[PDB]
Design a binder for this molecule. Structure first.
Ligand SMILES: Nc1nc2ccccc2s1
Ligand SMILES: Nc1nc2ccccc2s1
Ligand SMILES: Nc1nc2ccccc2s1
Ligand SMILES: Nc1nc2ccccc2s1
Lengths: 268, 269
Protein backbone atom coordinates (compact mmCIF):
# COMPACT_ATOMS: atom_id res chain seq x y z
CA UNK A 1 0.00 0.00 0.00
CA UNK A 2 0.96 3.64 -0.46
CA UNK A 3 -0.10 7.25 0.06
CA UNK A 4 -1.08 8.91 -3.23
CA UNK A 5 1.06 11.66 -4.88
CA UNK A 6 -0.68 14.53 -3.01
CA UNK A 7 -0.34 12.65 0.35
CA UNK A 8 -4.10 13.17 1.07
CA UNK A 9 -5.42 9.58 0.45
CA UNK A 10 -4.07 5.99 0.64
CA UNK A 11 -4.44 2.95 -1.65
CA UNK A 12 -3.87 -0.73 -1.05
CA UNK A 13 -4.46 -3.95 -3.04
CA UNK A 14 -5.71 -7.21 -1.42
CA UNK A 15 -5.84 -10.72 -2.94
CA UNK A 16 -9.09 -12.37 -1.68
CA UNK A 17 -8.28 -15.48 0.44
CA UNK A 18 -9.98 -18.92 0.40
CA UNK A 19 -11.34 -18.61 3.99
CA UNK A 20 -12.58 -15.04 3.29
CA UNK A 21 -15.36 -16.13 0.84
CA UNK A 22 -18.99 -17.37 1.34
CA UNK A 23 -21.06 -19.93 -0.68
CA UNK A 24 -20.85 -17.88 -3.94
CA UNK A 25 -16.99 -18.02 -3.73
CA UNK A 26 -16.99 -14.20 -3.33
CA UNK A 27 -15.79 -12.14 -0.30
CA UNK A 28 -18.29 -11.87 2.61
CA UNK A 29 -19.37 -8.36 3.78
CA UNK A 30 -17.35 -9.07 7.03
CA UNK A 31 -14.21 -9.73 4.90
CA UNK A 32 -14.88 -6.37 3.14
CA UNK A 33 -15.31 -4.57 6.53
CA UNK A 34 -12.04 -6.15 7.81
CA UNK A 35 -10.19 -4.88 4.66
CA UNK A 36 -11.69 -1.35 5.17
CA UNK A 37 -10.32 -1.43 8.74
CA UNK A 38 -6.89 -2.65 7.52
CA UNK A 39 -6.49 0.04 4.82
CA UNK A 40 -7.60 2.65 7.43
CA UNK A 41 -4.92 1.44 9.86
CA UNK A 42 -2.21 1.44 7.14
CA UNK A 43 -3.23 5.00 6.13
CA UNK A 44 -2.82 6.17 9.81
CA UNK A 45 0.64 4.43 9.95
CA UNK A 46 1.75 6.01 6.67
CA UNK A 47 1.11 9.55 8.01
CA UNK A 48 3.16 9.06 11.18
CA UNK A 49 0.61 7.81 13.74
CA UNK A 50 2.00 5.31 16.25
CA UNK A 51 1.01 1.64 16.73
CA UNK A 52 -0.13 2.54 20.33
CA UNK A 53 -3.80 3.27 19.50
CA UNK A 54 -5.63 4.09 16.25
CA UNK A 55 -4.90 7.46 14.66
CA UNK A 56 -4.25 9.22 18.00
CA UNK A 57 -1.95 12.21 17.96
CA UNK A 58 0.44 12.78 20.93
CA UNK A 59 -2.03 15.47 22.25
CA UNK A 60 -4.99 12.99 22.20
CA UNK A 61 -2.80 10.31 23.84
CA UNK A 62 -1.83 12.79 26.61
CA UNK A 63 -5.54 13.56 27.20
CA UNK A 64 -6.53 9.83 27.08
CA UNK A 65 -8.75 10.43 24.04
CA UNK A 66 -9.51 7.89 21.29
CA UNK A 67 -11.52 7.74 18.05
CA UNK A 68 -14.69 5.65 18.20
CA UNK A 69 -17.05 4.63 15.34
CA UNK A 70 -20.61 6.05 15.60
CA UNK A 71 -21.80 4.73 12.16
CA UNK A 72 -20.63 2.44 9.28
CA UNK A 73 -22.37 2.44 5.85
CA UNK A 74 -21.23 0.04 3.09
CA UNK A 75 -22.63 -0.33 -0.47
CA UNK A 76 -21.34 -3.22 -2.62
CA UNK A 77 -22.13 -3.56 -6.35
CA UNK A 78 -19.95 -6.68 -6.90
CA UNK A 79 -18.15 -8.79 -4.27
CA UNK A 80 -14.65 -9.83 -5.38
CA UNK A 81 -14.12 -13.51 -6.10
CA UNK A 82 -11.58 -15.78 -4.37
CA UNK A 83 -8.12 -14.98 -5.86
CA UNK A 84 -9.24 -11.63 -7.36
CA UNK A 85 -7.38 -8.43 -6.51
CA UNK A 86 -9.45 -5.58 -5.06
CA UNK A 87 -7.92 -2.07 -4.77
CA UNK A 88 -9.19 0.17 -2.01
CA UNK A 89 -8.64 3.94 -1.69
CA UNK A 90 -9.39 5.72 1.63
CA UNK A 91 -9.29 9.28 2.97
CA UNK A 92 -10.64 11.33 5.96
CA UNK A 93 -12.37 14.67 6.26
CA UNK A 94 -13.27 16.86 9.25
CA UNK A 95 -16.99 17.56 9.73
CA UNK A 96 -16.42 20.47 12.17
CA UNK A 97 -16.33 19.89 15.95
CA UNK A 98 -18.81 16.95 15.79
CA UNK A 99 -16.29 14.50 14.34
CA UNK A 100 -14.49 13.01 11.37
CA UNK A 101 -15.57 10.98 8.39
CA UNK A 102 -13.47 8.20 6.80
CA UNK A 103 -14.55 7.24 3.22
CA UNK A 104 -13.51 4.33 1.00
CA UNK A 105 -13.80 3.38 -2.70
CA UNK A 106 -13.34 -0.26 -3.80
CA UNK A 107 -12.29 -1.12 -7.38
CA UNK A 108 -11.73 -4.20 -9.53
CA UNK A 109 -7.92 -4.05 -10.09
CA UNK A 110 -8.13 -5.45 -13.63
CA UNK A 111 -10.95 -3.31 -15.07
CA UNK A 112 -10.64 -0.24 -12.81
CA UNK A 113 -14.46 -0.32 -12.28
CA UNK A 114 -15.87 0.84 -8.91
CA UNK A 115 -17.25 -2.32 -7.19
CA UNK A 116 -18.21 -0.71 -3.85
CA UNK A 117 -18.04 2.33 -1.57
CA UNK A 118 -18.21 3.03 2.16
CA UNK A 119 -18.41 5.84 4.70
CA UNK A 120 -18.07 6.03 8.48
CA UNK A 121 -18.51 8.67 11.22
CA UNK A 122 -16.03 8.84 14.10
CA UNK A 123 -16.15 10.85 17.37
CA UNK A 124 -13.54 11.63 20.06
CA UNK A 125 -14.20 9.91 23.40
CA UNK A 126 -12.21 9.75 26.67
CA UNK A 127 -10.97 6.09 26.84
CA UNK A 128 -11.45 5.93 30.63
CA UNK A 129 -14.82 7.66 31.26
CA UNK A 130 -16.44 6.90 27.84
CA UNK A 131 -17.55 10.60 27.66
CA UNK A 132 -17.50 12.71 24.49
CA UNK A 133 -15.78 15.55 26.53
CA UNK A 134 -14.81 19.18 25.60
CA UNK A 135 -11.50 19.00 23.68
CA UNK A 136 -10.47 22.38 22.01
CA UNK A 137 -9.21 23.32 18.48
CA UNK A 138 -5.51 22.51 19.05
CA UNK A 139 -6.33 18.74 18.68
CA UNK A 140 -8.12 19.17 15.29
CA UNK A 141 -5.28 21.38 13.94
CA UNK A 142 -3.03 18.35 14.21
CA UNK A 143 -5.28 16.28 11.84
CA UNK A 144 -6.24 18.90 9.21
CA UNK A 145 -2.87 18.61 7.39
CA UNK A 146 -3.64 14.95 6.51
CA UNK A 147 -7.13 15.61 5.00
CA UNK A 148 -8.23 17.19 1.73
CA UNK A 149 -9.76 20.66 2.20
CA UNK A 150 -12.33 20.67 -0.66
CA UNK A 151 -15.25 18.25 0.04
CA UNK A 152 -14.53 14.74 -1.28
CA UNK A 153 -17.48 12.43 -0.63
CA UNK A 154 -17.89 8.75 -1.46
CA UNK A 155 -21.71 9.55 -1.12
CA UNK A 156 -21.92 13.22 -2.23
CA UNK A 157 -25.72 13.60 -2.70
CA UNK A 158 -27.67 15.64 -0.08
CA UNK A 159 -29.93 13.32 2.08
CA UNK A 160 -28.48 10.02 0.69
CA UNK A 161 -28.84 6.51 2.35
CA UNK A 162 -25.65 6.94 4.46
CA UNK A 163 -27.16 9.84 6.45
CA UNK A 164 -30.72 8.49 7.03
CA UNK A 165 -32.08 8.18 10.60
CA UNK A 166 -32.65 4.54 11.70
CA UNK A 167 -35.75 3.85 13.87
CA UNK A 168 -35.88 1.42 16.84
CA UNK A 169 -37.29 -2.06 16.09
CA UNK A 170 -40.38 -2.76 18.25
CA UNK A 171 -41.14 -6.22 19.70
CA UNK A 172 -42.14 -8.80 18.56
CA UNK A 173 -39.31 -9.09 15.97
CA UNK A 174 -40.02 -11.22 12.87
CA UNK A 175 -36.73 -13.14 13.28
CA UNK A 176 -34.13 -13.49 16.05
CA UNK A 177 -30.83 -15.18 17.00
CA UNK A 178 -30.40 -15.23 20.78
CA UNK A 179 -27.46 -15.75 23.10
CA UNK A 180 -24.63 -14.57 20.79
CA UNK A 181 -21.28 -14.22 22.66
CA UNK A 182 -17.84 -13.05 21.49
CA UNK A 183 -14.84 -15.39 21.62
CA UNK A 184 -11.09 -14.43 21.79
CA UNK A 185 -10.86 -14.17 17.92
CA UNK A 186 -13.54 -11.43 18.04
CA UNK A 187 -11.32 -9.17 20.21
CA UNK A 188 -8.85 -6.55 18.96
CA UNK A 189 -5.28 -5.94 20.33
CA UNK A 190 -6.82 -3.89 23.23
CA UNK A 191 -9.27 -6.70 24.27
CA UNK A 192 -12.33 -4.81 22.92
CA UNK A 193 -14.88 -6.47 20.58
CA UNK A 194 -13.84 -5.66 16.99
CA UNK A 195 -16.41 -3.48 15.09
CA UNK A 196 -16.84 -6.11 12.36
CA UNK A 197 -18.22 -8.64 14.93
CA UNK A 198 -21.38 -6.49 15.36
CA UNK A 199 -21.96 -6.67 11.55
CA UNK A 200 -21.77 -10.48 11.77
CA UNK A 201 -24.18 -10.50 14.76
CA UNK A 202 -26.68 -8.29 12.89
CA UNK A 203 -26.61 -10.65 9.89
CA UNK A 204 -27.11 -13.77 12.12
CA UNK A 205 -30.89 -13.11 12.32
CA UNK A 206 -31.36 -12.84 8.48
CA UNK A 207 -33.20 -16.03 7.36
CA UNK A 208 -31.13 -18.68 5.51
CA UNK A 209 -33.60 -18.46 2.55
CA UNK A 210 -32.64 -14.79 2.03
CA UNK A 211 -28.86 -15.47 2.21
CA UNK A 212 -29.32 -18.36 -0.30
CA UNK A 213 -31.34 -16.30 -2.89
CA UNK A 214 -30.15 -12.70 -2.43
CA UNK A 215 -26.97 -10.65 -2.31
CA UNK A 216 -26.42 -7.95 0.32
CA UNK A 217 -26.36 -4.56 -1.40
CA UNK A 218 -26.38 -2.03 1.46
CA UNK A 219 -25.76 -2.15 5.24
CA UNK A 220 -25.99 0.90 7.56
CA UNK A 221 -25.09 0.29 11.23
CA UNK A 222 -25.19 2.70 14.20
CA UNK A 223 -22.95 1.88 17.24
CA UNK A 224 -24.46 3.02 20.58
CA UNK A 225 -22.72 0.95 23.26
CA UNK A 226 -20.03 -1.74 23.32
CA UNK A 227 -20.58 -5.43 24.07
CA UNK A 228 -18.10 -6.29 26.88
CA UNK A 229 -16.16 -9.60 26.60
CA UNK A 230 -18.65 -11.09 29.19
CA UNK A 231 -21.95 -9.65 27.77
CA UNK A 232 -24.48 -11.76 25.76
CA UNK A 233 -26.30 -10.34 22.72
CA UNK A 234 -29.70 -10.91 20.98
CA UNK A 235 -29.96 -10.13 17.27
CA UNK A 236 -33.47 -9.06 16.06
CA UNK A 237 -34.64 -8.46 12.45
CA UNK A 238 -38.00 -7.43 10.87
CA UNK A 239 -38.77 -7.14 7.13
CA UNK A 240 -39.71 -3.53 6.24
CA UNK A 241 -40.22 -3.99 2.45
CA UNK A 242 -35.60 -5.99 -3.31
CA UNK A 243 -35.88 -7.03 0.38
CA UNK A 244 -35.21 -4.51 3.21
CA UNK A 245 -34.84 -5.21 6.92
CA UNK A 246 -34.62 -3.24 10.18
CA UNK A 247 -32.16 -4.63 12.77
CA UNK A 248 -31.55 -4.28 16.49
CA UNK A 249 -28.75 -5.76 18.72
CA UNK A 250 -29.40 -5.62 22.46
CA UNK A 251 -27.94 -7.19 25.63
CA UNK A 252 -29.75 -10.52 26.42
CA UNK A 253 -30.77 -9.55 29.90
CA UNK A 254 -32.15 -6.07 30.40
CA UNK A 255 -32.49 -5.31 26.67
CA UNK A 256 -29.95 -2.45 26.55
CA UNK A 257 -29.42 -1.37 22.89
CA UNK A 258 -25.89 -1.80 21.52
CA UNK A 259 -26.58 -1.29 17.75
CA UNK A 260 -29.37 -0.55 15.26
CA UNK A 261 -29.23 -0.87 11.48
CA UNK A 262 -30.84 -1.59 8.15
CA UNK A 263 -29.92 -3.90 5.23
CA UNK A 264 -31.01 -3.90 1.55
CA UNK A 265 -30.78 -7.14 -0.49
CA UNK A 266 -31.24 -7.81 -4.21
CA UNK A 267 -32.39 -11.12 -5.76
CA UNK A 268 -29.47 -13.12 -7.27
CA UNK B 1 3.08 -17.06 -3.99
CA UNK B 2 4.85 -19.57 -6.20
CA UNK B 3 5.83 -23.21 -6.65
CA UNK B 4 9.56 -23.77 -6.06
CA UNK B 5 12.03 -24.64 -8.88
CA UNK B 6 11.51 -28.44 -8.55
CA UNK B 7 7.66 -27.98 -8.49
CA UNK B 8 7.43 -30.15 -5.30
CA UNK B 9 6.69 -27.40 -2.68
CA UNK B 10 5.05 -23.92 -2.59
CA UNK B 11 6.01 -20.65 -0.86
CA UNK B 12 4.00 -17.55 -0.06
CA UNK B 13 4.63 -14.31 1.89
CA UNK B 14 1.95 -12.67 4.10
CA UNK B 15 1.99 -9.19 5.71
CA UNK B 16 0.38 -9.53 9.19
CA UNK B 17 -2.81 -7.40 9.42
CA UNK B 18 -4.01 -5.15 12.29
CA UNK B 19 -7.11 -7.30 13.05
CA UNK B 20 -5.00 -10.51 12.92
CA UNK B 21 -3.03 -9.77 16.14
CA UNK B 22 -3.74 -10.30 19.88
CA UNK B 23 -2.78 -8.23 22.97
CA UNK B 24 1.01 -8.56 22.32
CA UNK B 25 0.54 -7.06 18.80
CA UNK B 26 1.66 -10.42 17.31
CA UNK B 27 -0.40 -12.85 15.14
CA UNK B 28 -2.82 -15.13 17.05
CA UNK B 29 -2.47 -18.94 16.60
CA UNK B 30 -5.87 -18.80 14.69
CA UNK B 31 -4.35 -16.23 12.26
CA UNK B 32 -1.39 -18.66 11.78
CA UNK B 33 -3.80 -21.61 11.16
CA UNK B 34 -5.78 -19.49 8.63
CA UNK B 35 -2.48 -18.66 6.75
CA UNK B 36 -1.52 -22.41 6.76
CA UNK B 37 -4.92 -23.15 5.16
CA UNK B 38 -4.47 -20.35 2.59
CA UNK B 39 -0.95 -21.43 1.48
CA UNK B 40 -2.28 -25.05 1.27
CA UNK B 41 -5.13 -23.89 -1.01
CA UNK B 42 -2.79 -21.82 -3.22
CA UNK B 43 -0.44 -24.84 -3.51
CA UNK B 44 -3.40 -27.04 -4.73
CA UNK B 45 -4.39 -24.29 -7.27
CA UNK B 46 -0.82 -23.96 -8.55
CA UNK B 47 -0.66 -27.69 -9.43
CA UNK B 48 -3.88 -27.67 -11.45
CA UNK B 49 -6.58 -28.57 -8.90
CA UNK B 50 -9.92 -26.87 -9.47
CA UNK B 51 -11.74 -24.37 -7.20
CA UNK B 52 -14.57 -27.04 -6.89
CA UNK B 53 -13.35 -28.65 -3.65
CA UNK B 54 -9.94 -28.82 -1.98
CA UNK B 55 -7.19 -30.77 -3.77
CA UNK B 56 -9.69 -33.12 -5.35
CA UNK B 57 -8.63 -34.87 -8.59
CA UNK B 58 -11.28 -35.52 -11.31
CA UNK B 59 -11.31 -39.26 -10.22
CA UNK B 60 -12.03 -38.28 -6.55
CA UNK B 61 -14.72 -35.81 -7.69
CA UNK B 62 -16.39 -38.56 -9.83
CA UNK B 63 -16.42 -40.86 -6.76
CA UNK B 64 -17.68 -38.07 -4.41
CA UNK B 65 -14.51 -38.30 -2.29
CA UNK B 66 -12.91 -35.42 -0.34
CA UNK B 67 -9.87 -34.85 1.89
CA UNK B 68 -10.63 -34.36 5.56
CA UNK B 69 -8.23 -33.35 8.42
CA UNK B 70 -7.73 -36.03 11.13
CA UNK B 71 -4.96 -34.07 13.06
CA UNK B 72 -3.32 -30.59 13.13
CA UNK B 73 -0.05 -29.98 15.07
CA UNK B 74 1.51 -26.46 15.20
CA UNK B 75 4.68 -25.36 17.04
CA UNK B 76 5.51 -21.61 17.13
CA UNK B 77 8.86 -20.21 18.34
CA UNK B 78 8.04 -16.54 17.56
CA UNK B 79 4.70 -15.07 16.45
CA UNK B 80 5.11 -12.43 13.72
CA UNK B 81 4.30 -8.86 14.69
CA UNK B 82 1.68 -6.62 13.05
CA UNK B 83 3.17 -5.38 9.72
CA UNK B 84 5.92 -8.06 9.63
CA UNK B 85 6.26 -10.37 6.62
CA UNK B 86 6.14 -14.11 7.31
CA UNK B 87 7.14 -16.58 4.56
CA UNK B 88 5.53 -20.02 4.59
CA UNK B 89 6.67 -23.08 2.63
CA UNK B 90 4.35 -26.13 2.31
CA UNK B 91 4.48 -29.59 0.72
CA UNK B 92 2.59 -32.97 0.90
CA UNK B 93 3.70 -36.57 1.22
CA UNK B 94 1.85 -39.88 0.92
CA UNK B 95 1.92 -42.09 4.03
CA UNK B 96 0.75 -45.25 2.21
CA UNK B 97 -2.96 -46.16 1.97
CA UNK B 98 -3.79 -44.56 5.36
CA UNK B 99 -3.57 -40.98 4.05
CA UNK B 100 -1.40 -38.00 3.31
CA UNK B 101 0.52 -35.49 5.34
CA UNK B 102 0.80 -31.75 4.61
CA UNK B 103 3.77 -30.00 6.31
CA UNK B 104 4.63 -26.31 6.69
CA UNK B 105 7.69 -24.23 7.69
CA UNK B 106 7.27 -20.57 8.74
CA UNK B 107 10.17 -18.10 8.45
CA UNK B 108 10.93 -14.48 9.31
CA UNK B 109 11.26 -12.91 5.83
CA UNK B 110 14.00 -10.49 6.90
CA UNK B 111 16.32 -12.85 8.83
CA UNK B 112 15.42 -16.16 7.16
CA UNK B 113 15.13 -17.76 10.65
CA UNK B 114 12.53 -20.55 11.16
CA UNK B 115 9.82 -19.06 13.45
CA UNK B 116 7.42 -22.06 13.41
CA UNK B 117 6.49 -25.44 11.89
CA UNK B 118 3.33 -27.46 11.40
CA UNK B 119 2.10 -30.87 10.27
CA UNK B 120 -1.33 -32.32 9.49
CA UNK B 121 -2.80 -35.79 8.65
CA UNK B 122 -5.54 -36.04 6.01
CA UNK B 123 -7.77 -39.00 5.01
CA UNK B 124 -10.10 -39.66 2.05
CA UNK B 125 -13.79 -39.74 2.99
CA UNK B 126 -16.99 -40.10 0.91
CA UNK B 127 -18.59 -36.61 1.09
CA UNK B 128 -22.15 -38.07 1.25
CA UNK B 129 -21.89 -41.07 3.64
CA UNK B 130 -18.93 -39.75 5.74
CA UNK B 131 -17.26 -43.21 5.41
CA UNK B 132 -13.53 -43.79 4.91
CA UNK B 133 -14.44 -46.38 2.21
CA UNK B 134 -12.37 -48.54 -0.20
CA UNK B 135 -10.56 -46.55 -2.91
CA UNK B 136 -8.29 -48.01 -5.66
CA UNK B 137 -4.50 -47.23 -6.16
CA UNK B 138 -5.32 -45.24 -9.35
CA UNK B 139 -6.49 -42.31 -7.11
CA UNK B 140 -3.09 -42.11 -5.27
CA UNK B 141 -1.17 -42.36 -8.59
CA UNK B 142 -2.74 -39.05 -9.56
CA UNK B 143 -1.22 -37.28 -6.48
CA UNK B 144 2.26 -38.86 -6.33
CA UNK B 145 3.62 -36.62 -9.14
CA UNK B 146 3.08 -33.51 -6.97
CA UNK B 147 4.92 -34.86 -3.85
CA UNK B 148 8.61 -35.39 -3.12
CA UNK B 149 9.58 -39.08 -3.05
CA UNK B 150 12.40 -38.97 -0.43
CA UNK B 151 11.02 -38.34 3.10
CA UNK B 152 10.81 -34.62 3.93
CA UNK B 153 9.54 -34.05 7.47
CA UNK B 154 8.84 -30.78 9.29
CA UNK B 155 9.05 -32.95 12.48
CA UNK B 156 11.95 -35.41 12.13
CA UNK B 157 12.56 -36.05 15.94
CA UNK B 158 12.39 -39.74 17.14
CA UNK B 159 9.32 -39.78 19.49
CA UNK B 160 8.17 -36.31 18.42
CA UNK B 161 5.12 -34.55 19.90
CA UNK B 162 3.24 -34.49 16.55
CA UNK B 163 2.57 -38.25 16.66
CA UNK B 164 1.74 -38.71 20.39
CA UNK B 165 -1.60 -40.31 21.40
CA UNK B 166 -4.01 -37.91 23.17
CA UNK B 167 -6.09 -39.35 26.06
CA UNK B 168 -9.76 -38.49 26.80
CA UNK B 169 -10.34 -35.82 29.49
CA UNK B 170 -12.36 -37.23 32.41
CA UNK B 171 -15.04 -35.18 34.24
CA UNK B 172 -14.96 -32.95 36.23
CA UNK B 173 -12.85 -30.64 34.01
CA UNK B 174 -10.76 -27.97 35.80
CA UNK B 175 -12.06 -25.22 33.44
CA UNK B 176 -14.89 -24.97 30.90
CA UNK B 177 -16.59 -22.61 28.40
CA UNK B 178 -20.17 -23.79 27.72
CA UNK B 179 -22.64 -23.14 24.92
CA UNK B 180 -20.26 -22.18 22.09
CA UNK B 181 -22.03 -21.90 18.69
CA UNK B 182 -20.70 -21.10 15.19
CA UNK B 183 -21.88 -18.04 13.30
CA UNK B 184 -21.89 -17.47 9.48
CA UNK B 185 -18.24 -16.14 9.54
CA UNK B 186 -17.14 -19.53 10.97
CA UNK B 187 -18.37 -21.37 7.85
CA UNK B 188 -16.37 -22.16 4.71
CA UNK B 189 -17.62 -21.83 1.04
CA UNK B 190 -19.40 -25.25 1.42
CA UNK B 191 -21.29 -24.21 4.62
CA UNK B 192 -19.14 -26.46 6.86
CA UNK B 193 -17.49 -25.17 10.09
CA UNK B 194 -13.89 -24.03 9.22
CA UNK B 195 -11.21 -26.20 10.91
CA UNK B 196 -9.66 -23.13 12.57
CA UNK B 197 -12.92 -22.47 14.53
CA UNK B 198 -12.30 -25.67 16.59
CA UNK B 199 -8.83 -24.31 17.56
CA UNK B 200 -10.52 -21.11 18.80
CA UNK B 201 -13.13 -23.15 20.74
CA UNK B 202 -10.41 -25.28 22.38
CA UNK B 203 -8.56 -22.12 23.50
CA UNK B 204 -11.78 -20.54 24.94
CA UNK B 205 -11.48 -22.63 28.15
CA UNK B 206 -7.83 -21.59 28.87
CA UNK B 207 -7.92 -19.21 31.90
CA UNK B 208 -7.38 -15.49 31.18
CA UNK B 209 -4.40 -15.49 33.64
CA UNK B 210 -2.58 -18.01 31.41
CA UNK B 211 -3.24 -16.05 28.18
CA UNK B 212 -2.03 -12.84 29.94
CA UNK B 213 1.27 -14.37 31.28
CA UNK B 214 2.20 -17.11 28.78
CA UNK B 215 2.69 -17.66 25.08
CA UNK B 216 1.28 -20.71 23.28
CA UNK B 217 4.20 -22.87 22.07
CA UNK B 218 2.51 -26.09 20.89
CA UNK B 219 -1.05 -27.18 19.99
CA UNK B 220 -2.01 -30.72 18.81
CA UNK B 221 -5.67 -31.23 17.86
CA UNK B 222 -7.48 -34.43 16.74
CA UNK B 223 -10.72 -34.03 14.68
CA UNK B 224 -13.26 -36.83 15.32
CA UNK B 225 -16.62 -35.42 14.24
CA UNK B 226 -17.88 -32.18 12.74
CA UNK B 227 -19.96 -29.54 14.58
CA UNK B 228 -23.03 -28.95 12.36
CA UNK B 229 -24.16 -25.30 11.85
CA UNK B 230 -26.98 -25.99 14.44
CA UNK B 231 -24.94 -27.94 17.08
CA UNK B 232 -23.74 -26.38 20.41
CA UNK B 233 -20.27 -27.12 21.85
CA UNK B 234 -18.72 -27.28 25.33
CA UNK B 235 -14.97 -26.64 25.67
CA UNK B 236 -13.25 -28.45 28.61
CA UNK B 237 -9.63 -28.04 29.84
CA UNK B 238 -7.57 -29.61 32.69
CA UNK B 239 -3.96 -28.74 33.66
CA UNK B 240 -1.70 -31.81 33.24
CA UNK B 241 1.65 -30.20 34.26
CA UNK B 242 8.13 -22.92 34.09
CA UNK B 243 5.93 -24.55 31.35
CA UNK B 244 2.14 -25.17 31.62
CA UNK B 245 0.47 -28.10 29.77
CA UNK B 246 -3.25 -28.77 29.33
CA UNK B 247 -5.52 -31.56 28.06
CA UNK B 248 -8.58 -30.42 26.07
CA UNK B 249 -11.91 -31.87 25.00
CA UNK B 250 -14.69 -30.40 22.77
CA UNK B 251 -18.04 -32.18 22.95
CA UNK B 252 -21.62 -31.46 21.85
CA UNK B 253 -23.98 -30.20 24.64
CA UNK B 254 -26.73 -32.35 22.99
CA UNK B 255 -25.44 -35.61 24.67
CA UNK B 256 -21.66 -35.23 25.20
CA UNK B 257 -20.53 -36.67 21.83
CA UNK B 258 -16.78 -35.92 21.33
CA UNK B 259 -15.91 -33.69 18.36
CA UNK B 260 -12.19 -32.96 19.18
CA UNK B 261 -9.47 -33.72 21.72
CA UNK B 262 -6.12 -31.95 22.09
CA UNK B 263 -3.22 -30.72 24.16
CA UNK B 264 -1.49 -27.32 24.47
CA UNK B 265 1.97 -26.35 25.84
CA UNK B 266 2.59 -22.78 27.07
CA UNK B 267 5.79 -20.98 28.14
CA UNK B 268 5.99 -18.06 30.61
CA UNK B 269 6.45 -14.69 28.82
N1 LIG C 1 -22.12 -10.80 1.34
C1 LIG C 1 -22.50 -11.32 2.51
N2 LIG C 1 -21.71 -11.41 3.55
C2 LIG C 1 -22.40 -11.95 4.63
C3 LIG C 1 -21.87 -12.11 5.91
C4 LIG C 1 -22.66 -12.68 6.88
C5 LIG C 1 -23.97 -13.07 6.61
C6 LIG C 1 -24.53 -12.87 5.37
C7 LIG C 1 -23.73 -12.30 4.38
S1 LIG C 1 -24.13 -11.93 2.73
N1 LIG D 1 -9.05 11.64 12.38
C1 LIG D 1 -8.11 11.40 11.46
N2 LIG D 1 -7.29 10.36 11.47
C2 LIG D 1 -6.56 10.32 10.28
C3 LIG D 1 -5.72 9.28 9.89
C4 LIG D 1 -5.09 9.36 8.67
C5 LIG D 1 -5.29 10.45 7.82
C6 LIG D 1 -6.15 11.46 8.17
C7 LIG D 1 -6.76 11.40 9.42
S1 LIG D 1 -7.91 12.51 10.12
N1 LIG E 1 -1.05 -17.02 20.27
C1 LIG E 1 -2.31 -17.23 20.68
N2 LIG E 1 -3.33 -17.29 19.88
C2 LIG E 1 -4.51 -17.47 20.61
C3 LIG E 1 -5.78 -17.59 20.06
C4 LIG E 1 -6.85 -17.75 20.91
C5 LIG E 1 -6.68 -17.83 22.29
C6 LIG E 1 -5.43 -17.77 22.85
C7 LIG E 1 -4.34 -17.60 22.00
S1 LIG E 1 -2.65 -17.47 22.39
N1 LIG F 1 -3.28 -35.08 -1.33
C1 LIG F 1 -2.58 -34.15 -1.98
N2 LIG F 1 -3.05 -32.97 -2.33
C2 LIG F 1 -2.03 -32.18 -2.88
C3 LIG F 1 -2.14 -30.83 -3.20
C4 LIG F 1 -1.04 -30.18 -3.70
C5 LIG F 1 0.18 -30.82 -3.85
C6 LIG F 1 0.33 -32.14 -3.47
C7 LIG F 1 -0.79 -32.82 -3.01
S1 LIG F 1 -0.93 -34.47 -2.47
Amino acid sequence: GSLTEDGLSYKEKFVVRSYEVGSNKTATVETIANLLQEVGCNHAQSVGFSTDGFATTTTMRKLHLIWVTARMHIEIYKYPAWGDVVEIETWCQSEGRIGTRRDWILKDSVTGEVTGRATSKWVMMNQDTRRLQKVSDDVRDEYLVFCPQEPRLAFPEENNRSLKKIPKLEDPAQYSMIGLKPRRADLDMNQHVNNVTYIGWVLESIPQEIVDTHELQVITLDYRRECQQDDVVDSLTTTTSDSQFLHLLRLSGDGQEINRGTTLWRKK
